[PDB]
Inverse folding.
C-alpha cells in the first residue's frame, strides 16, 4: 500500500507530506527497511503466497525504478 | 604638479619597490619651518589653515604612495602605520585648535551675572539661556559637533560612489509573486504579505523574501553611514532616488518649535517639531528596553533614548562611546534642572533615584572609560594617541608630566621626528598662550629635538 | 543499547560523556569510569534518522547540535548535567546534512551544509538571540559538506612564527553537488565570491582540513561519490594556491575523510571495509601504518 | 548481514571518525590489527570496554551493528621506561630550560660530550642485563660510530701535546676499524660456534674475512703456528701472506679470468686487494667478502683493500663505484643496509638509482656525508626508523637532530621538526609523560599557537584530583624549569568549574585574577555564600585581595556592587573594635560617616531571584538596625 | 624575501643547496674537461626529486619551453631587434600553450576518473569527447545540421582547436559526414595546412558569411570556430572572460599574426607591444584578480615575450627572489639578458623607443643588490 500510494499521490492519507524537492530524483529513503522485509519474506519460503508476494514486490520495484528514472530525466531536462 | 601624478601613475602599474617615504619626511621639515616663520603665533587661524593645507597635501602624497601597491612588506606596513599616525596627529591638532578657540572665547566671558529666571514657552529659549550659565555643556556640544565633522570628513565621496549602484524600483519580487497568486492562485505557498507597504510585514509579524530583507539591510547601512556623518540633504536625496523615505520621515519627531515669530511679515519657522517630546522619548525608552531588532536600529534607538545598560554593547567605537556618554549626561542634567525647578509629575526618561540625585561632572567620563571591562577598550586606553587625546581634553599637568617622564625613561621606542616636532610646537603654543611646565622637562624636550634635528 | 544502525559517535573533550547519534530514535549518553558504562542521559526530539553531530568547548558554553532527516536543526544546552531546549529551526529545501562549530580561536559559529541551493550560517552572539547569514545563488544543485578552517595554521599566512597575531576572521571551504568547489572568507562585512574551481561534474561527499598545531602547511583532503580524492596543499603568504592534485583514487563510494585532532592521521571510510590511516613521514611524504576492519 | 548487490542508494549505513584525547571511533571489529581470539568486543576504550549490544544474537533477518572506540597504543612498555628515561633525563639537563620573551622558548645547546656517556651507559646496561635485545646493540654501535665521528677523539692528551693532521686521520681510521671489528665480532663468534675444525678452504673463505684474536686461535690451530696469525691480525703495514695474496689478486682482476665450479674452494685470493670493480656480461664474482655480511665487508674494505693513505671519502667512493651499476655491466657486491636488528635493509649491491624507489639507504654513509659536507640533499634522506624495525621511538634520532641544529648544520625546513615534535609528544602522552613532551615541544618557535597547545595539555594532565607525585612534578616544573603559574591556575579553575567544588573554583579563579568573569562570579555567588555560611574570614581575605585600585579602576560595576560589601565589612570590624575597646569616639565618628554614606545605595542594589530577595531583606534589616544604633549613639548622654 | 647567505654554517634552503651542489659538479666537470650535458636537466631532476611540486612543474614548463630549436642570441637588445626569432618564439609559445591546454584536459580527466558521467577514454578524440561531456553534455542552444553521438559538434571542434589535436580534429571531420554542411573539405584543408591555406576566395566568402549571418547566435563555441576559420577582427569575445584567460589569449594569438599570410589584411592583425600593454595594464597585478595565482601570470608573461616583466614579477613575490635569480643565471648561461650599467637606479630601465615588457635589465644593479643583501656566507656558494 505504501508503494502504491507513493507511485500515485495518496501520501497525505498515510502522513508523508510533499516529497524531497531535489534536482536529481533518486532513492533517498533508507533501504535497510526494504532489505529487512526481503529477508523476513525469504526466511519462510514453504508456500506459494510468499513467492507471489515477492514477485509482485519485484514488479512494483521495477515500475517504481522506471518512474524514478523518468522523473529524474524530466528534472534534468530543465 | 604633474610629476607627482605621473610618478604615482607609473608606480601603480610598475613591478618595483620604491619607498619615497624617507624623501617625504626629509622634505616636509623645510616646508613646515617656512610655514612657521611665515605665519607666527599671532595669526593662529591662518597659521593652522596653512598647516592643515600642507598636512592634507602630504597625507594625500603618502596615501597615494601606499595605495600604489599592496601593503604586504614591512616597509609599506610601516608606511601605512605612519600614514595613520599622521591622520591621528592632524585630528589631534584640529582638536587642539578647537580647544584653543573655545578657551579664547570663554576668557572674555568667564565671569557672568544671573538675574532672570522666569521660564517662558518653547524650551529652546531655556536651553539657550542655560548655555551661557555653564561651559560644560558648551564644550560637550562642541566635541559632539567636532566628532560629527570628523565622521563627515571620513565618509568622503560616498555620495558620488552611491550613484554607481543606486536602484530605483523596489518590491519587484513581491509584486510579481502577488500578481502570480492573483492570476493563477499559485506562487505564494508561504506566509505571504497583504499590502506593499514597508510597515505591513513588520505589523503583521510575517516577513517575506530574504533578498528583499538583505537589500533593506544594505539600504539601512547606507542610511546609517549618511546620518552618522551629520548629513540630511544627501539622505533625503537617496530616499527620493530609491523609494524608502519612510525612515527620513520618521526621523523628525524629536525636534522642537522655534518660537520667534512676532508678526505676519516674518517667515514661518515655528513649524518643525512637536511638544510631545516627552512621550516620544518615553516610547524610545520602551523600545530600547524591549529591543529585539537589528543592530543599526538598536543603536539609533539607544542614541535617541539614553539607556546606558543597552548602550554599553551598542557603542562600536570610542568616539561613539564618548559621544553617547556626553549626550546622556548633558540630557540628564538639563532635564533635571528643568523639571525639579518647574514641574516634575511625569518622568519622561525612566531614571530612578540613583540617577536623579547625582550631579554628573567631567572626571566620571574618564572614570568609566578606564573602567570599561571590554578588552578592546582596555587595550585602546593604554597606547599613545588615545592617552594624548585624553590628556589634551582634560588639560591636566600632573599626570601629563608623569606620563612624559615614563616615556623619557622608556626611550625613543614610541616617538619619532614628526612626533617630537609636533610636541615641541604644541609646547611652544601653550607657553605663548598661558602657563608653562618644568625646566627639566623643557630642557629635555629641547635636547631631544635638537638631537633629532642633527640626526 | 542501539539495536539499529549507528551513525556518528563522538566523545567529550575530557573522556566522560559519549554522544552516539543513531537512527534508533534514541540518543543515549553513558559514562566512562573503571572501564565500564552507566547510562546518564537519554535525549530524543528528532523526527527522522539522526546524522552528524559536533561538540564545543565548555569555556564558551556547553552547546550541542544535532541534524536529522526532517529539515530541522536541533540545539541543546547543558546545565547541571541536563540538556534542555535552546534553538529549534525547521523548514528547508532538503534535509540538513553537515553541522560543525568554528574552532575556539574564532568563537561558536555553527555551519549548516545541505543540498538546499543556499547557505545558512548561524552565529551565536551574546547570551540569548542569534544571527542568520543567508547566501543564495551559490549552488546550482546544492551544498554537501562544510569544513571549518582556523587561523592558527602557519601554512596559510607566513607571519605566525614571528611574534605577530594574525587576523581572526571566518574562513572555510565547500564542495557541493553543483560540480564546483569554492572557498568562503568573511570579507567586506559579508560573504561573496572568493575562489571557485571546477574539478568534477557530479557529486562530492565531504572534505577535511588539516588542524596543524605546528606544521606550517595547510592541506585539505576531499572525497567524492565516485571514489575521487583531491589533496589541496598550501604553504604561501596572504593568498594561497590550492593545487588539485591526486593521491590514492577509488572506484566505490568513498564516504568520510577525517583528520586527527592535531593533523597527524587521516582516516578514509567508504565501501572497502578498510580505513587507511595515513601519516606524514619524516621525508615529507605520506605513509600508511595501521588499518582496521569495518 | 547484508551482502547482496545494490543499484542506487544514498545516505549511509556506518560512519567512522576521530575524537579528542587522540581517539578513533570506528565501525566493525579490529581484524586488521589483532588476530588472536582474545579480542574485546564493543569496547569504548582500551582494555575492557563492553558496550550493551543485544543485536548480536538477533541476526538472519537483521544485520548486526557494532562501533568501537579505541586509542592508538601499540606494543608494550614494561622495563623500557628507565631505558627511555635516562637519555631523556640527560638531554633535559643538557639543553636550556629557560624562558625567552612572552612564550617560553627553549634554545638548543651543542653537546657532543654526551655520545660517549650514552655509549658507556648502553655498555653497562648490556653488562648488568642478560635480556639485551638487538635494538640495544644497534643503539650502542650507532653511538660508538657517532663518538668516533663527531665525539672526542682523545685530543689534548698527555700535557699540552696534540697530534698532527695525519695522526688524527690515522686515529679516525683506527677508530672506525675498531668499531667495524666490534660490530662484526658477534657474527664471527656465531660462525665460530657453528663450525670450527672441519672443512679446509671452505672455512678459510670466511676465516679470512674474520681473522681477529678469538678466531685467530682457531686459525693457528688449523694452520700450525700462531706467530703468523698474530702478525696477520694486525693491520696498517703488517702484511706477509696477506700481501702475498694481494699481489696475486691484483693481477687476477687485471686479467680476464672467471669462475669455474664451487666458488668457495679455489677462489681464495678474492678477499684482500680488490681493484675497482669492472664487469662486462659474463660471470664475475670478486672484490670483498663475495656475498657475506656488510659489516665485516666494510671492515675488510677499510683494512686490507685500499692503502692506509686513502681517506674515508675515497673508501666510500670506491665502495659506491663497486656496488653501483654505472661501472659498465652488472654489480656483484653488497650494499651497507641500515641495521635495525640483524641486517634489516633491502637487498645487497644496489645503485642509488635503484634504491631511491623504496629501498632504505644506509645510516653510516649518511653520517659520514654529513660530517664531510652539508651541501647534499637531506629532504628525501634520513630514514624515520631509529635503528629499530618499528618507526616509533624517536630518541637517538631526535638527540642527533637537536645536536646538529645546535651545531648549525641542518637546513631551513621547519615541517620536519614540527612533525617530529608532534610524534614525540604523542608517544610521550601514550606512554605516560608530561614534562618531557612539554620540554621537547618548547624547542620550536611558536607564540600563541604553542601557548594554547601547552594550555590544553596542562588542562588535560593536571587536574584537581592530583596525586602527591603530580604535586611534586608541578613543583619541579615551577622550580627547576620555566613555566608561568597563571596558565596552571586557569586550567585548575576550568577543571574545578567542570566539577563543582565551589571553594576550590573560587580560589583558583582569584589566583588567576581575571576581570569580567571573576567580577561576575564573585558578585553573583561569593558574597551570598559568605553571608549564608558565615565565611567572614574568607570574605575579608577576598575583599583585601580585590581592594587594589588597579582592579577597581579597570573593571566596571565594582564600585556599585562590591563597595557596599567592603563598607559593610569595614563597619562591622570597626564596631567590633569599638565594642572591644569600650569608648572610641574617633572610630565612632568614622563609623557613623561610613554608615550614613552607605545609606544611599539601596536604590542601586536590587534583587534578581529568591536568594537576591533574601540577601536584600537581610541587608535592609541590618542597615535599619545599624541606623537605629547610630541614631541612638549620636545624641549626647550628658 | 630571499635566501641570503647565512654567517658561516647554519640552515639554508634545500632548493638553493641542491642548486649550489649541481653548480659545483658543473664546475668540477669544467675543470676536468669533459663536455657537460646541460644544467637545465639537472635542475629539473633536482626539482622533481625535491618535495616541492608547484615550482617543480613550473621549472619543467620553463625547460620544455626553452628546449625549442631556437638559435641562442647574445642579449635582449639583439633578441628584440631580430624579427625571425621573435615570430619563431611566438609560434613555439602558441604550440606550448596548446600542449598545456591538452595537459590540463588530461589532468581534469584524471581527476574525473572513469565512472563519472562518461570518464576519460584512451585516445585523443575519445579524451576530447569525454572532456566535452564532462563540461557541457547537454545540447547547447544554437545547433546547426546534426550531431556526433548526440554531442555538440561545434563545441567538439572548438575543444579540438584549443587542445591542438589536429589528428583528432581530422577524425571528427571524417566522422561528421552528414552531420555538417559543405565545409568538411574546408575544415580538412585548414587542418592539413600548417600555414593555413584554404583558398583566399573561400576565406573571403567565409569571412563575409560570418560578418553577415554568424553575428548573434546563441552558440559561443560555433561563433568562435567560425571567427577563427574566417579570420575576422583581432579579438572576438563571447563567454571566456571568467578567470580563464588562456582561451582568450589562444584566440587572440590565432587571429593575430605578425607576418602576412593567407587572407591577411588591415584590421585583422596586431603587434606584440599591443598584447604587452594589454597584459600589463588591463591584465596586470591588482586589476583582474590574478595576485592569488602568480604562476598563471608568470606563464603568460613568459609566453607573450616579456622576460624582464616575468623576472620583475617573480622578484616582487615573497620567497621567490631566489628562484628569480636562479632563472636569471640560467638565462645567462643560455646567453640572454642584455647588460646595462647603473648601480643606484631601478632594475627595470628602458630607452626612448622600447615597448613595455621588454626592458633593459640592469645587470650591474642586480649584481650590486645581490652582493649588498649578502653576509659572510659559505665558501661553496
Amino acid at each position: 500500500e505504501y508503494v502504491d500510494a507513493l507511485l500515485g499521490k495518496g501520501h497525505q492519507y498515510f502522513g508523508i507530506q510533499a516529497p524531497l524537492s531535489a534536482t536529481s530524483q533518486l532513492v533517498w529513503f533508507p533501504y535497510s527497511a526494504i532489505d529487512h522485509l526481503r529477508l523476513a519474506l525469504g526466511e519462510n519460503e514453504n508456500n506459494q503466497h510468499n513467492q507471489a508476494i515477492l514477485g509482485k514486490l519485484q514488479r512494483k520495484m521495477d515500475e517504481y525504478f522506471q518512474k524514478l528514472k523518468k522523473a529524474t530525466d524530466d528534472y534534468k531536462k530543465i | 604638479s604633474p610629476s607627482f601624478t605621473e610618478d604615482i601613475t607609473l608606480s601603480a602599474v610598475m613591478l618595483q619597490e620604491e619607498d619615497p617615504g624617507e624623501a617625504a619626511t626629509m622634505s616636509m621639515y623645510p616646508d613646515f619651518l617656512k610655514s612657521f616663520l611665515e605665519h607666527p603665533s599671532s595669526a593662529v587661524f591662518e597659521l593652522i589653515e596653512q598647516y592643515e593645507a600642507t598636512c592634507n597635501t602630504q597625507i594625500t602624497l603618502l596615501k597615494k604612495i601606499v595605495k600604489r601597491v599592496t601593503p604586504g612588506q614591512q616597509k609599506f606596513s610601516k608606511t601605512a602605520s605612519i600614514l595613520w599616525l599622521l591622520q591621528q596627529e592632524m585630528v589631534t591638532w584640529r582638536l587642539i585648535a578647537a580647544l584653543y578657540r573655545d578657551r579664547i572665547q570663554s576668557a572674555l566671558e568667564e565671569e557672568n551675572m544671573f538675574e532672570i529666571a522666569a521660564p517662558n514657552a518653547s524650551e529652546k529659549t531655556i536651553v539657550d539661556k542655560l548655555f551661557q550659565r555653564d561651559t560644560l555643556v558648551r564644550q560637550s556640544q562642541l566635541v559632539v559637533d567636532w566628532l560629527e565633522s570628523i565622521a563627515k570628513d571620513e565618509v568622503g565621496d560616498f555620495s558620488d560612489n552611491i550613484e554607481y549602484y543606486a536602484k530605483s524600483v523596489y518590491w519587484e519580487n513581491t509584486l510579481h509573486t502577488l500578481k502570480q497568486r492573483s492570476m493563477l492562485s499559485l506562487g505564494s505557498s508561504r506566509p505571504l504579505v497583504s499590502e506593499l507597504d514597508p510597515d505591513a510585514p513588520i505589523r503583521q509579524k510575517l516577513p517575506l523574501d530574504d533578498l528583499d530583507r538583505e537589500d533593506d539591510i544594505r539600504l539601512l547601512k547606507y542610511l546609517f553611514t549618511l546620518i552618522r556623518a551629520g548629513m540630511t540633504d544627501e539622505a533625503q536625496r537617496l530616499c527620493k532616488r530609491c523609494g524608502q523615505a519612510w525612515r527620513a520621515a520618521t526621523l523628525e519627531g524629536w525636534k522642537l518649535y522655534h518660537d520667534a515669530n512676532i508678526n505676519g511679515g516674518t517667515e514661518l519657522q515655528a513649524v518643525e517639531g512637536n511638544p510631545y517630546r516627552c512621550v516620544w522619548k518615553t516610547c524610545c525608552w520602551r523600545m530600547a528596553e524591549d529591543e529585539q531588532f537589528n543592530k543599526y536600529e538598536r543603536a539609533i534607538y539607544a542614541t535617541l533614548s539614553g539607556n546606558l545598560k543597552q548602550l554599553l554593547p551598542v557603542c562600536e567605537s570610542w568616539e561613539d562611546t564618548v559621544w553617547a556618554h556626553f549626550k546622556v549626561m548633558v540630557d540628564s542634567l538639563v532635564e533635571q534642572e528643568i523639571r525639579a525647578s518647574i514641574i516634575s509629575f511625569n518622568e519622561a526618561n525612566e531614571l530612578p533615584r540613583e540617577y536623579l540625585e547625582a550631579n554628573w561632572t567631567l572626571d566620571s567620563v574618564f572614570e568609566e572609560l578606564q573602567a570599561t571591562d571590554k578588552k578592546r577598550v582596555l587595550e585602546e586606553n593604554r597606547e599613545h594617541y588615545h592617552i594624548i587625546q585624553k590628556f589634551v581634553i582634560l588639560a591636566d599637568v600632573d599626570g601629563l608630566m608623569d606620563e612624559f617622564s615614563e616615556w623619557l625613561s622608556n626611550g625613543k621606542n614610541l616617538l619619532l621626528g614628526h612626533l617630537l616636532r609636533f610636541m615641541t610646537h604644541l609646547l611652544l603654543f601653550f607657553r605663548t598662550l598661558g602657563l608653562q611646565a618644568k625646566e627639566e622637562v623643557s630642557v629635555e624636550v629641547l635636547k631631544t629635538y635638537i638631537q633629532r634635528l642633527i640626526n | 543499547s542501539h539495536e539499529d544502525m549507528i551513525h556518528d559517535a563522538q566523545m567529550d573533550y575530557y573522556g566522560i560523556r559519549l554522544a552516539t547519534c543513531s537512527s534508533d530514535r534514541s540518543v543515549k549518553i553513558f559514562d566512562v569510569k573503571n572501564g565500564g558504562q552507566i547510562l546518564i542521559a537519554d535525549l530524543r526530539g528528532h523526527d527522522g534518522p539522526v546524522w552528524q553531530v559536533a561538540w564545543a568547548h565548555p569555556m564558551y558554553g556547553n552547546i550541542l547540535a544535532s541534524c536529522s532527516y526532517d529539515r530541522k536543526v536541533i540545539i541543546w544546552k547543558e546545565e547541571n548535567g541536563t540538556w534542555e531546549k535552546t534553538y529549534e529551526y525547521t523548514g528547508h529545501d532538503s534535509s540538513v546534512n553537515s553541522v560543525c562549530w568554528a574552532p575556539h580561536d574564532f568563537g561558536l559559529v555553527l555551519a549548516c551544509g545541505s543540498s538546499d541551493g543556499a547557505i545558512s550560517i548561524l552565529t551565536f552572539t551574546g547570551d540569548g538571540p542569534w544571527e542568520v547569514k543567508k547566501i543564495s545563488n551559490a549552488h546550482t544543485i546544492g551544498c554537501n559538506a562544510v569544513s571549518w578552517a582556523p587561523s592558527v595554521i602557519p601554512g596559510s599566512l607566513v607571519d605566525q612564527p614571528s611574534s605577530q597575531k594574525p587576523n581572526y576572521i571566518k574562513r572555510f571551504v565547500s564542495g557541493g553537488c553543483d560540480n564546483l568547489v569554492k572557498i568562503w572568507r568573511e570579507e567586506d562585512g559579508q560573504w561573496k565570491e572568493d575562489q571557485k574551481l571546477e574539478a568534477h561534474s557530479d557529486w562530492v561527499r565531504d572534505v577535511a582540513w588539516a588542524p596543524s598545531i605546528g606544521l606550517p602547511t595547510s592541506t585539505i583532503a576531499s572525497c567524492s561519490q565516485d571514489g575521487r580524492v583531491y589533496i589541496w596543499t598550501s604553504d604561501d603568504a596572504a593568498t594561497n594556491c590550492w593545487t588539485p592534485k591526486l593521491l590514492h583514487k577509488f572506484n566505490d563510494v568513498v564516504w568520510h575523510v577525517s583528520w586527527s585532532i592535531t593533523a597527524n592521521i587521516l582516516a578514509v571510510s567508504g565501501g572497502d571495509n578498510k580505513v587507511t590511516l595515513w601519516k606524514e613521514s619524516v621525508d615529507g611524504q605520506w605513509a600508511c601504518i595501521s588499518d582496521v576492519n569495518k | 548481514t547484508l551482502m547482496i548487490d545494490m543499484g542506487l542508494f544514498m545516505g549511509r549505513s556506518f560512519r567512522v571518525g576521530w575524537g579528542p584525547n587522540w581517539t578513533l571511533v570506528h565501525n566493525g571489529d579490529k581484524l586488521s590489527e589483532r588476530l588472536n581470539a582474545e579480542e574485546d568486543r564493543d569496547m569504548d576504550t582500551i582494555d575492557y570496554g563492553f558496550l550493551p549490544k543485544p543485536t548480536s544474537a538477533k541476526s538472519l533477518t537483521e544485520s548486526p551493528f557494532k562501533v568501537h572506540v579505541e586509542k592508538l597504543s601499540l606494543e608494550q612498555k614494561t622495563k623500557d621506561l628507565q631505558s627511555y628515561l635516562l637519555p631523556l633525563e640527560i638531554e633535559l639537563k643538557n639543553s636550556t630550560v629557560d624562558k625567552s620573551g612572552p612564550c617560553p622558548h627553549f634554545r638548543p645547546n651543542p653537546g657532543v660530550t654526551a655520545i660517549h656517556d650514552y655509549a658507556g651507559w648502553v655498555r653497562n646496561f648490556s653488562s648488568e642485563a642478560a635480556e639485551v635485545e638487538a635494538v640495544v646493540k644497534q643503539w650502542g654501535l650507532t653511538w660508538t660510530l657517532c663518538e668516533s665521528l663527531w665525539g672526542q677523539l682523545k685530543e689534548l692528551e698527555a700535557s699540552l701535546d696534540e697530534p698532527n693532521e695525519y695522526v688524527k686521520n690515522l686515529e679516525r681510521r683506527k677508530a672506525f676499524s675498531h668499531w667495524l671489528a666490534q660490530t662484526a665480532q658477534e657474527r664471527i663468534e656465531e660462525e665460530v660456534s657453528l663450525y670450527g675444525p672441519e672443512r679446509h678452504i671452505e672455512a678459510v673463505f670466511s676465516y679470512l674475512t674474520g681473522g681477529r684474536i678469538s678466531d685467530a686461535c682457531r686459525l693457528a690451530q688449523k694452520s700450525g703456528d700462531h706467530r703468523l696469525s698474530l702478525l696477520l691480525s694486525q693491520m696498517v703495514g703488517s702484511q706477509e701472506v696477506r700481501d702475498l695474496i694481494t699481489l696475486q689478486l691484483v693481477d687476477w682482476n687485471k686479467l680476464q679470468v672467471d669462475h669455474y665450479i664451487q666458488e668457495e674452494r679455489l677462489r681464495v685470493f678474492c678477499l684482500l686487494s680488490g681493484t675497482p670493480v669492472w664487469r662486462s656480461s659474463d660471470n664475475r664474482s670478486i672484490n670483498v667478502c663475495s656475498q657475506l655480511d656488510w659489516k665485516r665487508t666494510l671492515g675488510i674494505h677499510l683494512w686490507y683493500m685500499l692503502p692506509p693513505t686513502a681517506t674515508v671519502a675515497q673508501a666510500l667512493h670506491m665502495y659506491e663505484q663497486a656496488f653501483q651499476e654505472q661501472e659498465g655491466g652488472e654489480p656483484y657486491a653488497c650494499y651497507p643496509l641500515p641495521p635495525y636488528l640483524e641486517d634489516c635493509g633491502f637487498s645487497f649491491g644496489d645503485d642509488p638509482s635503484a634504491k631511491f624507489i623504496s629501498l632504505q639507504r644506509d645510516v653510516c654513509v649518511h653520517l659520514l656525508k654529513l660530517y664531510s659536507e652539508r651541501q647534499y640533499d637531506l629532504c628525501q634522506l634520513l630514514d624515520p626508523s631509529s635503528a629499530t624495525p618499528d618507526p616509533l621511538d624517536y630518541r637517538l634520532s631526535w638527540h642527533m637532530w637537536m645536536v646538529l641544529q645546535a651545531l648549525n648544520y641542518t637546513h631551513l625546513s621547519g615541517h620536519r621538526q614540527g612533525m617530529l615534535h608532534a610524534s614525540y609528544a604523542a608517544q610521550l602522552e601514550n606512554v605516560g609523560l608530561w614534562e618531557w613532551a612539554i620540554f621537547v615541544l618548547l624547542h620550536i618557535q611558536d607564540p600563541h599557537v604553542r601557548e594554547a597547545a601547552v594550555r590544553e595539555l596542562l588542562n588535560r594532565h593536571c587536574v584537581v584530583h592530583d596525586s602527591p607525585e603530580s604535586l611534586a612534578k608541578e613543583n619541579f616544573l615551577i622550580q627547576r624549569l620555566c613555566l608561568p603559574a597563571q596558565w596552571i591556575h586557569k586550567a585548575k579553575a576550568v577543571r574545578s568549574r567542570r566539577d563543582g567544588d565551589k571553594h576550590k573554583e573560587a580560589l583558583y579563579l582569584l589566583k588567576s585574577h581575571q576581570w569580567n568573569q571573576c567580577h561576575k562570579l564573585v558578585t553573583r555567588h561569593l558574597a551570598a555564600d559568605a553571608v549564608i555560611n558565615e565565611n567572614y574570614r574568607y570574605l575579608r581575605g577576598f575583599l583585601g585581595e580585590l581592594a587594589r585600585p588597579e582592579h577597581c579602576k579597570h573593571i566596571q560595576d565594582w564600585e556599585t556592587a562590591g563597595k557596599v560589601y567592603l563598607d559593610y565589612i569595614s563597619v562591622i570590624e570597626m564596631l567590633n573594635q569599638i565594642r572591644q575597646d569600650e569608648c572610641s569616639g574617633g572610630e565612632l565618628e568614622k563609623l557613623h560617616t561610613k554608615v550614613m554614606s552607605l545609606c544611599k545605595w539601596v536604590e542601586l542594589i536590587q534583587c534578581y531571584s529568591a536568594k537576591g530577595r533574601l540577601a536584600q531583606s537581610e541587608m535592609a534589616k541590618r542597615v535599619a538596625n545599624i541606623l537605629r544604633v547610630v541614631l541612638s549613639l549620636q545624641q549626647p548622654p550628658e | 624575501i630571499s635566501e641570503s647567505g647565512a654567517p658561516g654554517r647554519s640552515s639554508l634552503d634545500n632548493v638553493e643547496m641542491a642548486y649550489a651542489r649541481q653548480m659545483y659538479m658543473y664546475n668540477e666537470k669544467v675543470v676536468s674537461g669533459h663536455l657537460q650535458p646541460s644544467l637545465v636537466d639537472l635542475c629539473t631532476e633536482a626539482a622533481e626529486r625535491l618535495d616541492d611540486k608547484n615550482v617543480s612543474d613550473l621549472w619543467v614548463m620553463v625547460k620544455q619551453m626553452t628546449d625549442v630549436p631556437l638559435i641562442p642570441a647574445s642579449d635582449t637588445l639583439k633578441s628584440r631587434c631580430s624579427g625571425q626569432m621573435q615570430m619563431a618564439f611566438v609560434r613555439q609559445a602558441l604550440n606550448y600553450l596548446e600542449q598545456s591546454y591538452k595537459n590540463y584536459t588530461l589532468i581534469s580527466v584524471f581527476a574525473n576518473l572513469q565512472q563519472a558521467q562518461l570518464g576519460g577514454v584512451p585516445g585523443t578524440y575519445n579524451l576530447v569527447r569525454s572532456f566535452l561531456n564532462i563540461r557541457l553534455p547537454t545540447p547547447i542552444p544554437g545547433l546547426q545540421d546534426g550531431e556526433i553521438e548526440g554531442y555538440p559538434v561545434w563545441a567538439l571542434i572548438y575543444y579540438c582547436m584549443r587542445c591542438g589535436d589536429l589528428m583528432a580534429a581530422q577524425q571528427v571531420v571524417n566522422r561528421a559526414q552528414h552531420q555538417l554542411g559543405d565545409f568538411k573539405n574546408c575544415f580538412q584543408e585548414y587542418i592539413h595546412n600548417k600555414d593555413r591555406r584554404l583558398s583566399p576566395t573561400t576565406e573571403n566568402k567565409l569571412r563575409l558569411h560570418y560578418r553577415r549571418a554568424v553575428r548573434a547566435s546563441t552558440d559561443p563555441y560555433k561563433r568562435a570556430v567560425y571567427c577563427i576559420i574566417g579570420r575576422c577582427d583581432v579579438s572576438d569575445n563571447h563567454s571566456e572572460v571568467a578567470d580563464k584567460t588562456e582561451d582568450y589569449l589562444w584566440l587572440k594569438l590565432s587571429q593575430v599574426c605578425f607576418e602576412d599570410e593567407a587572407n591577411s589584411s588591415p584590421q585583422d592583425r596586431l603587434t606584440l607591444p599591443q598584447f604587452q600593454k594589454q597584459l600589463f595594464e588591463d591584465y596586470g597585478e591588482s586589476h583582474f584578480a590574478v595576485n592569488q595565482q602568480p604562476y598563471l601570470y608568470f606563464q603568460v608573461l613568459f609566453l607573450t615575450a616579456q622576460f624582464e616583466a616575468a623576472i620583475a614579477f617573480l622578484f616582487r613575490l615573497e620567497r621567490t627572489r631566489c628562484h628569480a635569480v636562479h632563472v636569471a643565471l640560467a638565462l645567462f648561461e643560455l646567453k640572454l639578458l642584455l647588460k646595462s650599467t647603473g648601480q643606484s637606479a631601478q632594475l627595470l630601465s628602458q630607452e626612448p623607443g622600447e615597448p613595455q615588457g621588454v626592458r633593459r635589465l640592469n645587470f650591474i644593479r642586480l649584481l650590486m643588490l645581490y652582493t649588498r643583501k649578502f653576509e659572510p656566507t659559505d665558501p661553496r656558494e
Notes: Chain D is about 55% helix and 0% strand. Chain D touches chain C through 74 residues (CB under 8 Å). The CA atoms of residues 77 and 431 of chain D lie 8 Å apart.
